[PDB]
């Protein structure tokens, strides 16, 4: 920036000969404007208020086409006092649209800057009269509609882009309205049956009534307009550029939860249902959800829109057609939702069609998900010892390996451009089996270029209830790669490359060796370190410890807890201490791990951390990172334990193994209060994806209670109504209001009181005494 400035001084100095030298000063003004926006971004309140000067001072007395009310707007962003040039910003405006309207040259963005501006500050502000906002937008669309795809400057990319960024706006803030004069106007509904009670009349109650009839029309057609905007916007952006697929899927979460009524729009929005492949795998990775929905109708437009849904997802059906046929081939139990059955049977037979692959490729599939059951079901009557090789003579050893066939189902790296495939055509036998309650084999899927993947296939358990944590991964992997400093500090989530069959059987994988904690620590006391604990001394004391918060009372476990601390700690602590043969590249991998930790306790805190034991958590070996399948603990699932109790659920071994003194507690808490502040700037798609995940009745086992979730199911694993519905989604969107923004108590409470409180919490005896007895021994 000095550099730039110094040279910016020097051209301006330099420049006082030739006629064409003006304009260069001209360029080299617009240069100081790109260093102030460079500085906007920064976010900066020093450099950028010296550029704007600078300007000032220089040749910009001219006032040529006097753009600087937006290109200098620092005036309310870098000093803070704002509402000081909104009517100046209008008079500008207005004044550029009276004369220099008729001399318009090819610079036509200037105007939809202005116009976007302006809506921003509107928005910003948001307490003037609805009458001149309406007034405001209805302009600012008209003169989109008449100025966009016009005259040549890049309008087609930018000025789509800008069309789809005025639209996307005006649509928000038309569905804010909507969802407010929704739930509030269902309170004024009950308000009204409560004072109607005394049992229309041209007072009040006519007036109210008409009231009720007109705005419910007048706001069924805005809701249409806006839809069918939005679909365009988006439609024409999946064919111009990304960044609107959270709007794409609220708008598609809204017409699914309105769906029957606007029939014509919903005709309207199936005809202009036409995006590229690579926005629609995107697409279809929710889609692949939303057939298995409680969308059931077929006499209505439901059968209507999923053969619209279909014909969507035409285009790229080489991954996507395959995942939805995978996801809809659940409810056949070959050795009440049937209108859905019927309709995904006719989507099927729509989509085979295609004679090139989808035929024989949906045969094999179902020979290989039968192939994978029966394997499953057979194998899991014998019982051997701790290794049970040969696991031969069950269905012709994978029908002679699978011969060659089209494979690799799960094909992370998704895209719309299709091509040469992978194949797994080569496979092996006598696989090893690995703990559970099940029997799992460790299956090497070996590619025919040498791809070996390491599945676990399992059986007689419900999978498909926990598969949405896959796509909460894909969510928060797309946010952070919108997110800018994410990218910076090297932020990573682990995902998961598994694909389940059905609710009665699943294929899970391994990475590279997912060794969890519990055996290890077991082989460290019996072989590595002795003199403090052995297994059967600690399987002791945790069973003592579960008969003292059965039987005895609180008091007296304050002590004995104590105890134990002071004479186990050792044993963890030169365990993990031992795990120290780190080399210099280590050095790095020791922070990476521990942000890896960071980030799970991050996505704890906003999603409700599940389960934590022995095969739950587990250790990668080189990956960065510690995967954990927790699937167990929903947001309001804490408390329906017995004895619930309120814990962050966060371990103190784990931080003092990774680093307990020297401030990396405070690092910690800065990079935490960072990420928050961060991702603390999209809070209507967070409530619009919640909406979703809690719109599942089937997936009882998250976020639906049923009979204490069934006792707690059987509470940890055997001793280690619509009205339910709507109290559990407002209290977690009331929790989720204190967690973002506010907190219970409804003061502010900056993220760093709010994860000093977390952490304070997390570390008090209280919590890590009343949970459980296993987690106790955890601690």
Known sequence: ??????????????????????????????????????????????????????????????????????????????????????????????????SCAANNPSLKLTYTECLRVCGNWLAETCLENPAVIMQTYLEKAVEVAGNYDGESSD????????????????????????????????????????????????????????????????????????????????????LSGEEHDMWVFRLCSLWLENSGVSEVNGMMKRDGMKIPTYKFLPLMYQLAA?????????????????NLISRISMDHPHHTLFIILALANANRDEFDEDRTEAANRIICTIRSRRPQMVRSVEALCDAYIILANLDATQWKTQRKGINIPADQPITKLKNLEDVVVPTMEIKVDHTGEYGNLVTIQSFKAEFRLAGGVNLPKIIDCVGSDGKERRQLVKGRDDLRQDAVMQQVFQMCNTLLQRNTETRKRKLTICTYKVVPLSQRSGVLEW??????????????????????????????????????????????????????????????????????????????????????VATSSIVGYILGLGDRHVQNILINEQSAELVHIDLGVAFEQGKILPTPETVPFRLTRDIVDGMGITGVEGVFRRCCEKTMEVMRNSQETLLTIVEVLLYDPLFDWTMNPLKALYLQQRPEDETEIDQSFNKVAERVLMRLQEKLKGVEEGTVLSVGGQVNLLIQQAIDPKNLSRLFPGWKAWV
């Open 1 to 98: 920036m000095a550099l730039r400035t110094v040279i910016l001084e020097i051209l301006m100095e330099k420049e006082m000969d030739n006629s064409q030298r003006e304009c260069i000063k001209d360029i080299l003004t617009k240069h100081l404007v790109e260093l102030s926006i460079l500085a906007r971004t920064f976010k900066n309140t020093q450099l950028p208020e010296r550029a704007i000067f600078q300007i000032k001072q220089y040749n910009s007395v001219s006032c040529g086409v006097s753009e600087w009310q937006l290109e200098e707007a620092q005036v309310f962003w870098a000093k803070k006092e704002q509402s000081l040039a909104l009517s100046i910003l209008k008079q500008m405006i207005k004044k550029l649209d009276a």
């Open 155 to 238: 309008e087609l990319r930018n000025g789509k882009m800008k069309a789809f960024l005025s639209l996307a706006r005006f649509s928000d803030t038309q569905y804010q309205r909507i969802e407010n004069y929704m739930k509030s106007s269902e309170f004024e509904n009950k308000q009204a049956l409560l004072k109607r009670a005394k049992e229309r009349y041209t007072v009040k109650v006519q007036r109210e009534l008409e009231l009720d009839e007109l705005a419910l029309r007048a706001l069924k057609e805005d809701r249409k307009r806006f839809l069918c905007k939005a679909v365009e916007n988006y439609i024409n952006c999946l």
């Open 290 to 306: 939303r057939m298995g929905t409680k969308m059931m109708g077929g006499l209505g437009f439901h059968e209507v829109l999923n």
């Open 511 to 596: 990475c590279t060796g997912t060794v969890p904690i519990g055996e290890f620590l077991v082989n460290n006391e019996d072989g590595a370190h002795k003199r403090y604990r052995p297994n059967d001394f600690s399987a002791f004391q945790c069973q003592k410890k579960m008969m003292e918060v059965q039987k005895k009372s609180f008091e007296e476990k304050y002590e004995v807890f104590m105890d134990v601390c002071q004479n186990f700690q050792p044993v963890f602590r030169y365990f993990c201490m031992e795990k120290f043969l780190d080399p210099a590249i280590w050095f790095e991998k020791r922070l990476a791990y521990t942000r890896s």
